[PDB]
Structure formats: C-alpha cells, structure tokens
Write a protein that binds this ligand. Structure first.
Ligand SMILES: CCCCCCCCCCCCCCCC(=O)O
Ligand SMILES: CCCCCCCCCCCCCCCC(=O)O
Ligand SMILES: CCCCCCCCCCCCCCCC(=O)O
Lengths: 108, 110
C-alpha cells in the first residue's frame, strides 16, 4: 500500500544517511527537500545531508528540492529505473542548486 | 592539435544544428542560458548555449542560468550518443553550477 511503500523508502534513506561517516570524505553537503508524490497526497521530507538528519516537514530555503512519484522512487531504489533514465523520462523535478543536485546524482 | 579542433568543431556544429532545429514557437521548457566549458589539452573551450534566444556563441556569459563543465572525450561521447547525460551525471563526469530546474529540463530534452 502507499503507507508501507512510503515507510520503506524513508527507512532506506534514513539507513543511507545513518551510514555516512561525518568526518570521512563527503561531497554532498546540504539540505534537500524531498516531495514524494503519492496517489493520495504529497509526503514531505527534509533530508539534511549537512547535519545528517531526516525529518518529516517542509524546510525553509532548502538547497535543492526534489519532487518524484512514489513508484518511481521505489524503482530507483530497487534499481529497475536508473537515475539517468528517470531524468530522460522527466520523472524528477528539481529546483535549487544544480551543483548539489549533480553531486547527489553521483552518490545515489 | 588538429584532432582537438576537429572534436570541438563537431561538438559545436552538432549543438548548433540541434538549437537551430527548435521551433521557437513550439513546446519548449528549457528557457535558459547555459555556459558550456569543455576542458581540452589546448585550454578550456568556452561556449554560450542560449536556449532562450536559440543562439550559440563562443565566449563567457555574465550570469548564465547553468554552467556546465565537462572533459572533451566525455562531451564528444555525449554529442555522439555514446554516453547519455544521465550516465554522465551518475559517473561524476559533469560539473554543474546554477539552476537545478533548468539542468534537469536540459537532461530530459537532450
Ligand atoms: C533528496 C532527494 C533524494 C535523497 C536521496 C537519498 C539521500 C540518502 C543519502 C545518501 C548520500 C550519502 C552521501 C554522503 C557522502 C557524501 O556526501 O559524499
Ligand atoms: C541533476 C540530476 C539530479 C537527480 C538525482 C536526484 C534523484 C533523487 C531520487 C533518490 C531516490 C533514492 C532514495 C532511496 C535510497 C536508497 O534506496 O538507497
Ligand atoms: C551536458 C549538457 C550538454 C550541453 C549541450 C546542449 C545541447 C543543445 C540543447 C538542445 C536543447 C533543445 C531544447 C529546445 C526546446 C526546449 O526548450 O524544450
């Protein structure tokens, strides 16, 4: 269902952020607003890769905002849809800093 | 280096053909000026790809919407459809600064 799917994606993001060494090599420092489009609404999450924290909400002046459908997010996570292909297909909507978005693309 | 020259000319001719093929009145979502810097052993090739006015000019624009910095061999491969702009980004082969919305729009339409 939608709830379980959203929970799955968020758990996965939290485990990825949890696994970062805050003092080790790091390229993606900034705050990402993540908007997950679901059939029932938008799920809004703040992925703070500066502070290495993930909270539900809408951040004021995030560095990058990423808007993506829930099914597309699951497909990216499961590697059945590459980020390159998502981009070609216009499945990812961005605003903000192109530098930080590009760096994020390198590490996903 | 004749080979660098040939490579650069081919990239630019290709971009000019593509820009010239755009219907200024048909559907368009990439309304931005892109600074394109191509690294070469002879120096950085600096080109302005103006997708607002649909013009390509050699030079450095003041305050472009997006700046794209990329190596000659990688740009050639993007140009010849041997590397997608998406594979490129995933591989760290493209340095960007500027407007992420316009960058993403470019990635979709190219
Ligand atoms: C905000 C759009 C989707 C967010 C993508 C999930 C983020 C998970 C974090 C993984 C990135 C790890 C990068 C840490 C090391 C580095 O900064 O180079
Ligand atoms: C300039 C292009 C930017 C494109 C890169 C942003 C896309 C963000 C989507 C992230 C989805 C991955 C989250 C799941 C985490 C995981 O399973 O590892
Ligand atoms: C890695 C970036 C490569 C830079 C080269 C840009 C390629 C030329 C751009 C052609 C885009 C055509 C889009 C016109 C219609 C539209 O705005 O949607």
């Amino acid at each position: 269902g939608i709830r379980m799917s959203v929970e799955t994606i968020i758990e996965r993001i939290k485990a990825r952020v949890g696994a970062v060494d805050p003092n080790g090599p790091r390229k993606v420092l900034g705050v990402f607003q993540l908007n997950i489009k679901t059939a029932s609404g938008v799920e809004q999450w703040i992925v703070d890769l500066k502070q290495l924290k993930v909270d539900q909400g809408v951040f004021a002046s995030p560095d990058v905002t990423v808007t993506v459908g829930l099914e597309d997010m699951l497909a990216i996570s499961g590697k059945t849809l590459t980020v390159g292909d998502a981009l070609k297909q216009g499945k990812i909507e961005l605003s903000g800093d192109a530098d930080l978005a590009a760096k994020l693309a390198e590490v996903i």
